[PDB]
Amino acid sequence: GSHSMRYFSTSVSRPGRGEPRFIAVGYVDDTQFVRFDSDAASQRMEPRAPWIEQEGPEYWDEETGKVKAHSQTDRENLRIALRYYNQSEAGSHTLQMMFGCDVGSDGRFLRGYHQYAYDGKDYIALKEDLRSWTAADMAAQITKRKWEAAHVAEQQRAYLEGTCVDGLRRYLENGKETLQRTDPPKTHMTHHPISDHEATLRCWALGFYPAEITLTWQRDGEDQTQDTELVETRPAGDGTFQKWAAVVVPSGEEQRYTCHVQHEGLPKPLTL
């Protein structure tokens, strides 16, 4: 099916406590496959999936190089941000960066991303077209104008339509076994009493991959059962994800209410 590559990197300044910490992570869909941490012993790009170890020392030499450079640009960018937002050195600030590409079933380019958020709020983002920028506030406008004049988006376009897709395709082959897989959700169902004249019953999905799941309920065959207590998709730790949705019912109508589980590991959805 469709696939995606993403690199998520965070830079947090530590005024007087050295140089801002740089943590960079790479994913193929929901699989952390690479790691970079400035404070870590290694001081190199590290593997996080078995299928990336088959890459020679040349890969790890280059990948360590690019990431230590990105680390410097964002070090540079955090000092600049203080100037643009009229802030002090004494404060600790966050600079996050996200970049990647989406590809279809055929492993061909679909979308590209190149974006920044300073202090948890958007700063500048690369447009769907891959040619212009989205400068959120007033300060980013100064960055957008210089980058548009210099035609910087082209350096990014060449990566996203080229190297990003070419590289993601290569990962999808080498890691065919684990990455192309679709672990269906291991269906569960529990029942507990609210206060004698009321009761609660929740269903669970537990051993699935990817993180895409729909735990929607139904009362008396009607889709109308929106007053549900739904939780956020959480990682089991063994490379699989889980989610649950608890619905309160009038004691004696526990059997009247059905639950519909939507996932790609199941050809037809599951009703409980």
Binding site: A24, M45, K66, H70, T73, I80, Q155, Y159, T163
Partner: peptide
């Protein structure tokens, strides 16, 4: 494959 992020906000 990581990208070359070699241009700062002021360049």
């Amino acid at each position: 494959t990581y990208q070359w992020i070699i241009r700062n906000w002021e360049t």
